[PDB]
Amino acid sequence: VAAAEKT
Amino acid sequence: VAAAEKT
Amino acid sequence: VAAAEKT
Amino acid sequence: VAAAEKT
Amino acid sequence: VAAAEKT
Amino acid sequence: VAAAEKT
Amino acid sequence: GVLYVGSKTKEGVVHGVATVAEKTKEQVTNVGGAVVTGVTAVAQKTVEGAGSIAAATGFVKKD
Amino acid sequence: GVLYVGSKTKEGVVHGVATVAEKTKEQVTNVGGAVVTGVTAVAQKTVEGAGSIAAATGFVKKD
Amino acid sequence: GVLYVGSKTKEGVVHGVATVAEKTKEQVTNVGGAVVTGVTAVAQKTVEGAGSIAAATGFVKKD
Amino acid sequence: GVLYVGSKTKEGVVHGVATVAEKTKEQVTNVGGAVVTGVTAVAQKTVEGAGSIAAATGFVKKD
Amino acid sequence: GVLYVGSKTKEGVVHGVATVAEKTKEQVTNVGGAVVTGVTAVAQKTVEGAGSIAAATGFVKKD
Amino acid sequence: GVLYVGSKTKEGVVHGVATVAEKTKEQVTNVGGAVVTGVTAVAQKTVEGAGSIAAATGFVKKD
Amino acid sequence: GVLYVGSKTKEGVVHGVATVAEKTKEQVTNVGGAVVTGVTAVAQKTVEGAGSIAAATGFVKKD
Amino acid sequence: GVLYVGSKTKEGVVHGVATVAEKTKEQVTNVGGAVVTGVTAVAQKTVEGAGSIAAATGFVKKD
Amino acid sequence: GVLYVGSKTKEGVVHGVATVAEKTKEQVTNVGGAVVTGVTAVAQKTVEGAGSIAAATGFVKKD
Amino acid sequence: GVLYVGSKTKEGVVHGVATVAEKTKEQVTNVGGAVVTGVTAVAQKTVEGAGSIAAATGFVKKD
Amino acid sequence: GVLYVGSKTKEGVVHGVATVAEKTKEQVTNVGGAVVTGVTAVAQKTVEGAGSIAAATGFVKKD
Amino acid sequence: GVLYVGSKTKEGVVHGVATVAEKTKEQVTNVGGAVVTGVTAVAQKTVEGAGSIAAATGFVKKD
Amino acid sequence: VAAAEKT
Amino acid sequence: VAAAEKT
Amino acid sequence: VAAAEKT
Amino acid sequence: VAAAEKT
Amino acid sequence: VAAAEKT
Amino acid sequence: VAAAEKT
């Protein structure tokens, strides 16, 4: 599981 | 599982 | 499973 | 599990 | 488990 | 477990 | 009399390569796969085994 | 009389490489995978085994 | 009489490499994977074993 | 009479490398993986064993 | 008569490397993984064992 | 007559390296992992054992 | 309001040049004259005067 | 309002040139004259004066 | 308001040049003249005067 | 308001030059003249005067 | 308000030069003349006077 | 308000130079003339006077 | 005057 | 005057 | 006057 | 006057 | 006057 | 006057 949001 | 959103 | 949305 | 948000 | 937020 | 926030 | 066996060969050689790459902006975005870029001026020899340059496999699943 | 076996060879050789790269902005974003960049002027030999340069595999799953 | 076996060879050699890299901004972001960058002027030899340069695997899962 | 076996070889050699890198800003961000950068002017030989340069594995999980 | 076995070789050698790196700002941020940077002018030989340069593994988990 | 075995070799040698590094600001931040920087002009030989230069492992968990 | 006079110009600029010259044998023989060779990657500006690059005059005689 | 006079120009610029010259044997023989060779990637600007690149004159005689 | 006169210019600039010269044998023989070789990566500006790079005059005679 | 006169310029600048020269044998033979070799990475500015780089004159005779 | 005259300029600057020269044999033989070799990474400014780099004159005769 | 005259300039500067010179044999033989060799990493400024680097004159004769 | 014989 | 013989 | 003979 | 013989 | 014999 | 014999 991986996540990488740019906001 | 992977995710990578740019918002 | 992979996802890659640009918004 | 990893996470890396830029806000 | 890892986390790395820049805000 | 690791955490590394820049605020 | 002289015998040459497998001799004076060149096998897997690169020479005399000039390269210029002006690129204002490069972006790689990779999710869950493999990406290979820019492999330049590479030379290889194998004996008795498989040999790969810049090969990519997105994933291997064998459940 | 002279015998040469496997001799005077060049095997896996790189020479005389000039490279310039002006790049104002490089970005790599990698999630859960593999990225390989910029592999330049590489030389290899193997004997009795597989040889890989710039190979990438995104994941191996064998549950 | 002279015998040469496996002699005077060049095997896995790099020489005479000039490189310039002007890059105003480099960013690598890696989550949960492998990233390899910039491998330059590398030479290897192996005997009786697999040899890898700049190889990347994102993960290996064998639960 | 002379015998040469495995002699006068060059095996895994690098010489004569000039490199310049002007980079105004480098950033590496790594979460939970492996990053390898800048590997320059490297030479190796192995015998009877696997040999890796700049190899990266993001993780190994075997629960 | 003369016998040379395994003699006069060069094996794993680096010489004549010039390098310049102007970098206004370097940042590494590492969380829970491995980062390798800047490995320069490295030479190695092994016999009867695996040899690694600049290898990185993010973690090994075997619960 | 003369016998040379394993003799006059160079094995794992570095010489003639010039390096300059102008860096206005270096920062390393490491949480819970491994970071390796700046490994320069290193030479090694091993016999009968594995040899690692600049290897990094983020952690090893075997509960 | 803004005025730019003679501004933001590029005037006599060279950048991003890669050149390789493998030449097994160069000979110059000069008797009583001028020889110019190899002028590479040269940039000049003059103001209020004649400008010459790689100019050759074999002799000037004004008895 | 903005006025640009003579601004943002490029005047005498060269960029992005890659050149390779393999020449087994070069010979120059000069007797009593001028020879110019190899002028590569040259850029110039002049103001208020004559500009010459790679000009050659064998002799000037004005007795 | 802002005025720029002669400002932000580049005038006589060279950057990002990689050059390699493998030459097994160079010979210069000069009798009674001028020889110029190898002028590389040169940048100049003059004001109010003649400017010359790699200029050769075999002789000046004014008896 | 701001005034820039002759400001923020670059005038006679060289940066980021990598050069390699492998030359097995150099010979210069000079009799009664001038020889100039190898001028590399040179930058100059002059004001109110003539400026020369790598200029050669074989002789000046004014009896 | 701000005035800049002749300010923030770069005038005659060299930076970031890497050079390697492997030369098995150099010979200079000079009889009665001038020889200039190897001028590398030189920067100059003059004001109100002529400026010369690597200039050579074989002789000046004015009897 | 601020006035800058001739300020914040760089004028005749060299920095960040790496040089390596492997030369098995250097010979200079000079009879009756001038020889200049090896001038490296030199910076100069003059005001109100002629400035010379690596200038050679074989002789001056004025009987 | 100039001359250049190869013999 | 110049001369350059190869013999 | 200049000369350059090979003999 | 200059000379450069090979003999 | 100059001479430079190689023999 | 100069001379430079190699023999």
Numbering used by the authors:
A (entry chain j), B (entry chain g), C (entry chain e), D (entry chain l), E (entry chain n), F (entry chain p), ...: 16 to 22
G (entry chain E), H (entry chain G), I (entry chain J), J (entry chain L), K (entry chain N), L (entry chain P), ...: 36 to 98
What does the paper say about this structure?
To investigate the interaction between WT αSyn and ATP at a molecular level, we turned to cryo‐EM and solved the structure of WT αSyn amyloids in the presence of ATP to a resolution of 3.08 Å. The high‐resolution structure of WT αSyn amyloids in the presence of 1 mm ATP also shows a type 1A‐fold, as expected since the ATP was added after fibril formation. Interestingly, however, there is an extra density corresponding to the N‐terminus forming a β‐strand involving residues 16‐21. Furthermore, there is an additional density for ATP in the cavity between the two protofilaments. The ATP density is not fully resolved, and thus its exact orientation cannot be stated with certainty. The diffuse density rather indicates that ATP binds in several similar binding poses dynamically. The cavity in which ATP is found contains several lysine residues: Lys43, Lys45, Lys60, as well as Lys21 and Lys23 (predicting its position based on the partially resolved residue 22) in the additionally ordered β‐strand. The sole histidine in the polypeptide, His50, is also deep inside this cavity. The additional β‐strand in the N‐terminus of one protofilament interacts, in the same vertical layer of the dimeric amyloid structure, with the ordered core of the other protofilament, resulting in a peptide loop enclosing the protofilament interface cavity and adding a β‐sheet to the overall cross‐β structure. The following plausible mechanism of catalytic action emerges: With an induced fit mechanism, ATP binding to type 1A αSyn amyloids (anchoring at K43 and K45) recruits an additional β‐strand comprising residues 16‐22.
